[PDB]
Amino acid sequence: FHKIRNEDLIFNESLGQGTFTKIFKGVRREVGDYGQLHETEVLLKVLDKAHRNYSESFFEAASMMSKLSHKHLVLNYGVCVCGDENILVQEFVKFGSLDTYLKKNKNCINILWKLEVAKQLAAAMHFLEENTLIHGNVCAKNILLIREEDRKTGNPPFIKLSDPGISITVLPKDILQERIPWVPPECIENPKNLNLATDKWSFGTTLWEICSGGDKPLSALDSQRKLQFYEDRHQLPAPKAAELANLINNCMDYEPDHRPSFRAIIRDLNSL
Ligand SMILES: N#Cc1ccc(Nc2nc(N)cc(-n3ccc(CO)n3)n2)cc1
Fold first, then answer.
1. Where is this site: Breakpoint for translocation to form PCM1-JAK2 fusion protein?
2. Count of the separate structural domains present in the chain
3. What is the signed CA dihedral for 24, 147, 30, 37, rounded to 10 degrees?
4. Are 100 and 147 a contacting pair, CB within 8 Å?
5. Residues β-bridged to residue 21
């Protein structure tokens, strides 16, 4: 990663928290193309100092994805590791993460918006699958909205997939259980089962979020009951707007080997 000096970064408002992290809007002073000086809006993602022992996984999350370049993958500018900080410096996305956007905007998101977003997520995942790169934490909180839909110019919304954060292969068991039903059953059984098929299951859970106005699937279940949901082999209820329910359930297959390729997922979306 490119190294960015702390002197060149200004922290502004908090934008929320992730697992062992806090996110802020900020500004980076930099020399850009043609030698022009810029003050660039950035997302600053800060590893909690109490959890500095996760720093390798925290950065590994950003690194492997940054090794590929793609229009639907978030841009990482660099890292700041001055002093006692562990900071990832990422492009600032104007409309934020999709979980929040969906909850705020339930009433004006229709089936065509959901389908376009699903197709774009599936394109990003097909790119990862073709490169045999595991993401490991597909969820609406890790989808960023670059551009809102504009009917008045026929313009679709445009999303990017952000980094997965610290890997489920190193996280505490109780955090994994709280992340059911994004973490697939085989990874609850053994987090080293993380595989390309993991991302197909989580993609189904993410489609359910997209279809459910920002609701969290199984939120009313505590961790014990989320575990038993897997033990009993349940599927999620169909969203009220159920156009994608079959695809969600086909992706959320308890047999990892039976989960469909992202090419087949795309063909299915294109058929609707
Ligand atoms: N109101 C408001 C508002 C909130 C956030 C943004 N911008 C943004 N830009 C990014 N590159 C990443 C994120 N994230 C948000 C959650 C995560 C965890 O994945 N990231 N948010 C813009 C407006």
1. 174-175
2. 2
3. -130
4. no
5. 18, 47
Is 245 close to ligand 1, i.e. is its CB under 6 Å away?
A: no
Q: Are residues 265 and 139 in the same domain?
A: yes
Q: Which helix (H) or strand (E) holds 24?
A: strand 21-31
Q: How many CB atoms are closer than 10 A to CB 221?
A: 14
Numbers of helices and strands, H then E, in the chain: 9, 7
Ligand 1: which of 17, 42, 58, 162 to mutate, most ligand atoms within 8 Å of CB? 162
Query: CA of 152: how far to CAs of 3, 4, 117, in Å?
Result: 42, 40, 18
Would you give the distance in Å from CA 155 to the centre of its chain?
A: 23
Among the listed residues 257, 220, 250, the one whose alpha carbon sits nearest the alpha carbon of residue 235: 250
Between CA 198 and CA 182 the distance in angstroms is 9
- Where is the domain boundary, 28, 57, 92? 92
Q: Does residue 239 have a cis peptide bond before it, meaning omega lies within 30 degrees of 0?
A: no
Mutate to test the pocket of ligand 1, among 12, 13, 14, 15 (most ligand atoms within 8 A of CB): 15
Question: What is the CA(232)–ligand 1 centre distance, in A?
Answer: 36
Residue 247 C-alpha to ligand 1 middle, in angstroms? Answer: 28
Task: Pick the last residue of a domain from 73, 92, 111.
Answer: 92
- What distance lies between CA 30 and its chain's CA centroid? 28
Shortest-distance atom of ligand 1 to CA 162: 19
Find the helix or strand (DSSP H, E) in which 59 lies.
helix 55-66
* Co-location of 111 and 161 in the same domain: yes
Is the CB of residue 21 less than 8 Å from the CB of residue 31? no
